[PDB]
Symmetry: C2
Subunit: 172 residues, 2 copies
């Protein structure tokens, strides 16, 4: 689903308030994500054993990713008026994560959900249905473009996904 | 290993050697891992010492209290953006056209949209180097100082060339 102009401008304004604290917000997002989904830490050699969120917050590798994530998303959000630019930015991010980092797409789905949870909580006083819908669309946009990029490089998404163990007595 | 005369030129060059690049990249990564706090500290130091530079920022140009400046969303957003753009430069120092493309974009935007006097780039870069020198005072033999001096000169030379290109 495509953002209307009003939806775009709402997201852009809300996002700019987050980006003014780019690292505190990115770190909060990532820590919440890793605490809730420790399997996602597998990709990060320097914090894959960390359990304590206080320790995670101070991990340089985590913090660098937090800063890079916020920068990349900032480029997306500032350019939402330019669909072709949005597509190119997310295609680069997607292809890098598919090919260099080999990240399971499930982690993009999940992280995008965490971002939305953090926004809904940070802006709970200012989050009516119109604004909720705008952010939901942005989540969809991010995941859609990233998965398209994975498909383009030949990642074949499976149902059940690739990580799920086999049923001992399956059914069709 | 180059000839002596080519070494003499590498010393005055714009471009960082592989050894200089790796030094800068390693040290920079420590700063970028604290992108927000470092960027904000850099800008607040800059504006306190160079209040004339505040003029370009419509939402904090009137502020004299450094505590208020520090909390200004416009200042903080710029701090994050500066750190992101510099990070792109440092990570791509091996690729001169990528460095040039990032710094041309920045330079032309600041010349044309923001109408910033180019000297402020020289000044701000200086402040970045001060903050680096403070963070790393032990890991800093003369060659390491020189590597950062070259980065500063590289940034300013690219930006000034972008200003000239757009007819500043
Ligand atoms: C909104 C979603 C995300 C964005 C915008 C994003 C963006 C970035 C960027 C810009 C970089 C640096 C350039 C590069 O090395 O490719 C990066 C690196 C990386 N990303 Fe992401 N990322 C996202 C989600 C994820 C997820 C879900 C994972 C795994 C759970 C992940 C794992 C990694 C890893 C392992 C690196 C390399 C880290 C390192 O070298 O220290 N990313 N990401
Ligand atoms: C390392 C040097 C610098 C870098 C890498 C840098 C980078 C950036 C970037 C990426 C943006 C956002 C995109 C844009 O609007 O152009 C920006 C905006 C801006 N920059 Fe810089 N900048 C630097 C130095 C300066 C200096 C020295 C000044 C003035 C003293 C300045 C004034 C501005 C202004 C006024 C904006 C627009 C801010 C807004 O609309 O909220 N910048 N800069």
């Amino acid at each position: 689903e495509e953002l209307s102009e009003a939806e775009r401008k709402a997201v852009q304004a809300m996002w700019a308030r987050l980006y003014a604290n780019c690292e505190d917000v990115g770190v909060a997002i990532l820590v919440r994500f890793f605490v809730n989904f420790p399997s996602a830490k597998q990709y990060f050699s320097q914090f894959k054993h960390m359990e304590d969120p206080l320790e995670m917050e101070r991990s340089p590798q985590l913090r660098k990713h937090a800063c890079r994530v916020m920068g990349a998303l900032n480029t997306v959000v500032e350019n939402l008026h330019d669909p072709d630019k949005v597509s190119s930015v997310l295609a680069l991010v997607g292809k890098a994560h598919a090919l260099k980092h080999k990240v399971e797409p499930v982690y993009f789905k999940i992280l995008s959900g965490v971002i939305l949870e953090v926004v809904a909580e940070e802006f709970a006083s200012d989050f009516p249905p119109e604004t909720q819908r705008a952010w939901a669309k942005l989540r969809g946009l991010i995941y859609s473009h990233v998965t398209a990029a994975y498909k383009e490089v030949g990642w074949v998404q499976q149902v059940p996904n690739a990580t799920t163990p086999p049923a001992t007595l399956p059914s069709s």
